[PDB]
């Protein structure tokens, strides 16, 4: 029966069927008294399988590589008469024909990516086997069984939870689609459980530590759960393309199904402010416990969690930050800024905004579905936007296909290309109704694309990977290729340059904006410059113009002219937004030639960090007293200040709350931690109050045995 299908869909890793202990059709053939899977952290298996790190008790192993087991019999194994095989099965509806029920026959010698087990040793009543997974095996928690074969059918062991084995992806294996050439990278992109996230803006790149915590207790299990909550067919869990294509779509709770509820409202009603999270562990576990979407997240929190996901299952992955990101490009390689007849920027017609920065993920894998050469890193943005399917994540999009405008290849390529390679067009909206494009800034969007380096906390410029150099046959042709493969370029694109340098200030200080015109030709010009200063979210969405100023300049031929504006703290203070960012529009009009000059910059105000100092024994198992101090920089009282602490391997994420803090006051929070991991660890603190927020801190600790 079924109608639709003989056997229901096998799409849960938790669901299980029981296998018959005996099933004959038509007793001393051998019987198992015990099975030993050399698990143990210190032991052979886990260490050689790089799984020795997980805070987990069952045996964890990576596909395509051989592992050890010993089977204890009720009598010596006689190769002349006995017969058996090890079994591994996943889900309620196993099926050999779909890698969900796996035989593993004992073999003379193990072959290239084929399941098999070579008998390696025989004692009195014990056989030591060397079992080999296939490099294409599904990933998930399998059930183990030993089946003795009688000529009348089989006798097999019974449900034993202690023998469940986990098979993860294998970056160290030459045949795994997710294979990585060398240890440095593998260590970093897979084994590292801490990363730095780059925010701020290009001329003042800021960083903060994020805990991936992929080896903490429960996380490996939550990742299987996420796939289960997505009803992911088990037969597809061995495909990294499909894992990232499905796992990413689960990150953003459309309605209420995914992991996180995205919110950029600066209020965050009944949830945690995206800026408070110190890492992935809290979220993922909190999701598991409620089976409901965690609130709230924004692009970096979605990218953090997804990076934990990928690495935890064994897929090499890293977060990437793009500076001046054209999110919601809809494949349009242009951003429209509208100007009034008198040079100003039309506050009403300009509803499109460039993000100060926008992070996304990159996952390493091959691309058997695309032509040769498009393997390597794949861009996967889990912050939705309208693509072909309409308003979902994008990717895996081949990073190499992006750099060459080869946007005819899946998945979601035009939307990442246009995120990183699109121009700003300045248009004048005439009082009668027409529009004319003044100039185009082809070097503002995608200025800098960066990621944390293999060494330590330093940044790595990865801009050349997404694009060539603006103004070279290369960048020009890639741009043309993308145009024929559906990248939209709607509008077809007086020697007086001018630029302005804002001087990065501290939260609460007055600072300056220094405009500089340089009349390059041989004429005396009369210009009318206009300065527009707006308070904004990091996404570029404005909240208010807090400073408007217009001024005339009489430039001398071949000379120059500098104009310094002074921004007093009081003009902005009362209405800043979370990441304390401001945007500046500087437009000038040369009434002689009618040529227009426009420039825009973003600046994020600086705030002093949280202090973390350790006081104790930096030895695993021994106590150390962690101290976190914060000093209210503002001249007003902070209330309901939630301090946070984390550091995978040192402590579990904790959070304390202070009813209030008077201005210029300081608070200390002593905490005794019991470091369970040895080596270079790191603490992480974060702060968020009803007023001030998006304030972090970190310390690097050295813990040994």
564 binds, among Yb ion, its own copies, none (CB under 5 to 8 A by kind): none
Q: Which of 225, 341, 214 is nearest to 287 (CA)?
A: 225
For the packed helices 280-290 and 219-229, what is the interaxial angle rounded to 10 degrees?
50
Question: Rule CB under 8 A: is residue 3 a binding residue for its own copies?
Answer: yes
What is d(CA 374, CA 638) in angstroms, rounded to the nearest whole number?
51
For residue 580, give the nearest of 632, 504, 640 by alpha carbon: 504
- Beta bridge partner(s), residue 598: 587
Exactly one of 231, 289, 593, 666 binds its own copies (CB under 8 A); that residue is: 231
Residues 289-328, interacting with its own copies (CB under 8 A) = 328
Among 234-242, 563-571, 617-625, 637-645, the segment contacting its own copies (CB under 8 A): 234-242
How would DSSP label each residue in 482-528?
A: HHHTT-B--S----EEEEEEE---BTT--EEEEEEEEE-SSS-EEEE
Across the beta sheet with 654-661, what order do the strands follow?
Answer: 654-661, 638-646, 679-688, 693-703
Catalytic-labelled residue, pool 221, 233, 282, 381: 381
* 358 catalytic residue (yes or no): yes
Q: How far is the CB of 500 from Yb ion (least distance, A)?
A: 15
Q: Is 381 a catalytic residue?
A: yes
How many distinct helices (H) and strands (E) make up the chain? 10, 39
Beta bridge partners of 703: 679
Q: Does 92 bind its own copies (CB under 8 A)?
A: no
CB of 93 to its own copies, least distance (A): 9
CA distance 34 to 73: 7
Which of its own copies, Yb ion, none lies near 72, with the C-beta cut-off 5 to 8 A by kind? none
**Site pattern 373..412 for its own copies (x: CB under 8 A):** -------------x-xxxx---x-----------xxxxx-
Q: Are 335 and 365 in contact (CB under 8 A)?
A: no
Told to check if 340 binds its own copies by CB under 8 A, we report no
Using CB under 8 A as the criterion, what x/- string covers residues 263-282 for binding its own copies? xxxx----------------
Instruction: Compute the least distance from the CB of residue 539 to its own copies, in Å.
Output: 6
Residue 230 interacting partner from its own copies, Yb ion, none (CB closer than 5 to 8 Å by kind): its own copies
2 binds, among its own copies, Yb ion, none (CB under 5 to 8 A by kind): its own copies
Of the candidate spans 108-116, 117-125, 181-189, 345-353, the one that interacts with its own copies by CB under 8 A turns out to be 345-353
Task: Calculate the dihedral angle through the C-alpha atoms of 96, 99, 105, 110, rounding to the nearest 10 degrees.
Answer: 150
In angstroms, give the least distance from the CB of 550 to Yb ion: 9
**Which candidate in 223, 299, 312, 673 is catalytic?**
299
Q: Which one, 255 or 265, has the nearer CB to Yb ion? A: 255
Binding to its own copies by residue 423, rule CB under 8 A?
A: no
Helix or strand holding residue 123 (H, E): strand 116-123
Give yes or no: 412 in active site. Answer: no
Residue 442 binding result from Yb ion, its own copies, none, given CB thresholds of 5 to 8 Å by partner type: Yb ion
Distance (Å, whole) CA 318 – CA 688: 26
- Choose, by CB under 8 A, the member of 113, 218, 236, 508 that binds its own copies: 236
In the chain, the N- to C-terminal Cα span, in Å, equals 61
470 is in an annotated binding site: yes
353/587 with CB nearer its own copies: 353
Give the closest residue to 610 by CA, choosing from 196, 200, 192, 209.
Answer: 209
Q: How far is residue 117's CA from residue 102's CA, in Å, rounded to a whole number?
A: 12
- Enter the DSSP assignment of 569: G
| Least Cβ distance, residue 443 to Yb ion (angstroms) | 7
Three-point CA angle 113, 117, 121, nearest 5°: 140
Start-end of H helices in 28-135: 44-48
Contact call for residue 107 and its own copies (CB under 8 A)? no
Give yes or no for a contact between 230 and 246, defined as CB atoms under 8 angstroms apart: yes
Range 544-548, long-range pairs (CB < 8 A, 24+ positions)? 544/575, 545/347, 546/571, 546/572, 546/575, 546/582, 547/571, 547/572
Residue 7 binds its own copies, judged by CB under 8 A: yes
| Contact of residue 330 among Yb ion, its own copies, none (CB under 5-8 Å per partner type) | its own copies
Q: C-beta of 348: minimal distance to its own copies in Å?
A: 10
371 binds, among Yb ion, its own copies, none (CB under 5 to 8 A by kind): its own copies
Antiparallel, parallel or unpaired: β 693-703 and 679-688: antiparallel
601: closest CA among 358, 342, 336, 323? 323
- Locate the DSSP E strands across 249-304: 260-262, 294-297
**DSSP string of 334-353?**
EEEEEE-TTS-B-TTT----
| Closer residue to its own copies, CB minimum distance, 54 or 309 | 309
Other Cβ atoms less than 10 A from the Cβ of 427: the count is: 22
Find which of its own copies, Yb ion, none residue 386 binds, CB within 5 to 8 Å per kind. its own copies
440 binds its own copies (CB under 8 A): no
103, 471, 608, 663: which one contacts its own copies (CB under 8 A)?
A: 103
The answer to the question of residue 352 lying near its own copies (CB under 8 A) is: yes
Residue 542 or 616: which CB sits closer to its own copies?
A: 542
Cα–Cα distance between 338 and 427 in angstroms, integer? 5
In the complex, the residues that contact Yb ion under the rule CB under 5 A are: 255, 421, 442, 470, 552
Least distance in angstroms from the C-beta of 602 to its own copies: 16
In the 3-class helix/strand/coil scheme, how is 587-655 assigned residue by residue?
EEEECCCCCEEEEEEEEECECCCCEEEEEECCECCCCEEEEEEEECCCCCCEEEEEEEEECCCCCCCEE
Shortest distance, CB of residue 577 to its own copies, whole angstroms? 8
Which residue lies nearest Yb ion, judged by its C-beta?
255
For 304-335, give the DSSP string. Answer: HHHHHHHHHTT--EEEEEEEEE-TT-TTB-EE
- What is the helix (H) or strand (E) element at residue 86, kind and residue range? strand 84-89
Instruction: Choose the one of its own copies, Yb ion, none that binds residue 470, judging by a C-beta under 5 to 8 angstroms depending on kind.
Output: Yb ion
**Least Å from the CB of residue 453 to its own copies:** 31
| Residue 704 interacts with which of Yb ion, its own copies, none, CB < 5 to 8 Å by class | none
| Those residues with Cβ within 8 angstroms of residue 275's Cβ, 6 or more apart along the chain or in another chain | 578, 579, 686, 688, 693, 694
Does the annotation place 423 within a ligand binding site?
Answer: yes
Residue 674: is it exposed, middle or buried by C-beta count within 10 angstroms (0-12/13-18/19+)? Answer: middle
Catalytic residue among 50, 327, 358, 583: 358
Q: Is 105 in the site for its own copies (CB under 8 A)?
A: yes
- Site size for its own copies, by CB under 8 A? 64
Of 85 and 589, which CB lies nearer to its own copies in the complex structure? 85
Q: Which stretch binds its own copies (CB under 8 A): 27-35, 178-186, 245-253, 304-312?
A: 245-253
Q: Least Å distance between CB 417 and Yb ion?
A: 10
Question: Closest CB to its own copies among 433 and 456?
Answer: 433
Whether 421 has a binding-site annotation, put simply, is: yes
Contact between 608 and its own copies by CB under 8 A: the answer reads no
Q: Which does 654 bind (CB under 5 to 8 A by kind): its own copies, Yb ion, none?
A: none
In the complex, minimum distance from the CB of residue 249 to its own copies, in angstroms, rounded to a whole number: 7
Q: How many CB atoms lie within 10 A of CB 61?
A: 26
Determine the longest span between alpha carbons in the chain, in angstroms: 108
Interrupted backbone of the chain, residues before each interruption (C–N > 2.5 Å): 26, 493
From the annotation, which residues make up the binding site for Ca(2+)?
A: 421, 423, 470, 475
Binding residues for its own copies, rule: CB under 8 A, are: 1-7, 83, 85, 95-97, 103, 105, 149, 230-233, 235-236, 241-242, 245-246, 249, 262-266, 328, 330, 336, 349, 351-353, 368-371, 386, 388-391, 395, 407-411, 414, 432-433, 484-486, 537, 539, 541-543
The catalytic residue positions are 299, 358, 381
From the annotation, which residues make up the binding site?
A: 421, 423, 470, 475
């Amino acid at each position: 029966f079924g109608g639709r299908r003989a056997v229901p869909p096998n799409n849960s890793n938790a669901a299980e069927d029981d296998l018959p202990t005996v099933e004959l059709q038509g007793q001393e053939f051998l019987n198992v008294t015990s099975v030993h899977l050399f698990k143990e952290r210190w032991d052979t298996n886990k260490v050689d399988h790089h799984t020795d790190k997980y805070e987990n008790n069952k045996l964890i192993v990576r596909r395509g590589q051989s592992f050890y087991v010993q089977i204890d019999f009720s009598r010596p194994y006689d190769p002349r008469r006995d017969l058996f095989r090890v079994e591994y099965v996943i889900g309620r509806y196993p099926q050999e024909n779909k890698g969900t029920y796996i035989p593993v026959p004992i073999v003379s010698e193990l072959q290239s990516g084929k399941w098999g087990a070579k008998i390696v040793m025989r004692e009195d009543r014990s056989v030591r086997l060397s079992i080999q997974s296939s490099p294409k095996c599904i990933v998930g928690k399998f059930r183990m069984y030993v089946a003795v074969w009688t000529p009348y059918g089989v006798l097999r062991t019974s449900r034993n939870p202690e023998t469940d084995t986990y098979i993860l992806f294998n970056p160290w294996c030459e045949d795994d689609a997710v294979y990585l050439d060398n240890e440095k990278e593998r260590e970093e992109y897979v084994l590292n459980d801490i990363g730095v996230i780059f925010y701020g803006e290009v001329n003042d790149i800021k960083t903060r530590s994020w805990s991936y915590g992929q080896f903490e207790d429960g996380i490996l299990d939550t990742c299987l759960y996420v796939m289960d909550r997505a009803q992911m067919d088990l037969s597809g869990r061995g495909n990294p393309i499909k894992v990232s294509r499905v796992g990413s779509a689960m990150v953003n709770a459309k309605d209420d199904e995914g992991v996180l509820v995205g919110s950029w409202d600066n209020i965050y009603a009944y949830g945690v402010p995206p800026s408070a999270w110190t890492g992935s562990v809290d979220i993922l576990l909190e999701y598991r416990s409620s089976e409901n979407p965690v609130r709230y997240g924004q692009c970096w929190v979605f990218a953090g969690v997804f990076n934990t996901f990928l690495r935890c299952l064994g897929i090499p992955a890293r977060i990437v930050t793009n500076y001046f990101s054209a999110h919601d490009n809809d494949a349009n390689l242009q951003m429209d800024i509208f100007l009034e007849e008198d040079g100003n920027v039309n506050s009403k017609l300009t509803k499109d905004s460039v993000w100060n920065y926008h992070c996304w993920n990159e996952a390493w894998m091959t691309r058997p579905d695309l032509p040769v050469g498009f393997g390597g890193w794949q861009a996967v943005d889990s912050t939705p936007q309208e693509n072909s399917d309409g308003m979902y994540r994008c990717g895996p999009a081949s990073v190499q296909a992006i750099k060459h405008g080869h946007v005819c290849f899946q998945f979601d390529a035009p939307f990442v290309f246009a995120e990183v390679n699109s121009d700003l067009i300045y248009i004048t909206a005439k009082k009668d109704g027409t529009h004319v494009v003044e100039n185009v800034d082809a070097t503002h969007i995608g200025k800098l694309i960066v990621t944390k380096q293999i060494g330590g906390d330093g940044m790595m410029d990865i801009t050349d990977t997404y694009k060539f150099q603006e103004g070279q046959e290369e960048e020009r042709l890639a741009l043309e290729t993308a145009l024929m493969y559906g990248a939209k370029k709607p509008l077809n694109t007086s020697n007086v340059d001018m630029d302005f340098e804002v001087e990065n200030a501290v939260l609460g200080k007055d600072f300056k904006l220094s405009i500089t015109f340089r009349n390059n030709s041989h004429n005396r010009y009369t210009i009318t410059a206009y300065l527009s200063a707006n308070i904004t979210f990091y996404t570029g969405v404005p909240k208010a113009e807090f400073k408007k100023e217009t001024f005339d300049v009489t430039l001398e031929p071949l000379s120059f002219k500098k104009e310094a504006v002074l921004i007093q703290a009081g003009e902005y203070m009362g209405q800043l937004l979370e990441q304390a960012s401001l945007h500046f529009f500087v437009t000038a009009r040369i009434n002689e030639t009618r040529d227009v000059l426009a420039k825009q910059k973003s600046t994020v105000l600086t705030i002093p960090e949280i202090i973390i100092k350790v006081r104790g024994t930096q030895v695993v198992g021994s106590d150390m007293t962690v101290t976190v101090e914060f000093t209210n920089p503002l001249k007003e009282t902070l209330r309901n200040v939630w301090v946070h602490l984390d550091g995978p391997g040192v402590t579990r994420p904790m959070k304390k709350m202070f009813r209030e803090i008077r201005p210029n006051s300081t608070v200390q929070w002593e905490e005794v931690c019991r470091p369970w991991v040895s080596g270079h660890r790191k603490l992480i603190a974060s702060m968020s109050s009803d007023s001030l927020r998006h304030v972090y801190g970190e310390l690097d600790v050295q813990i040994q045995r």
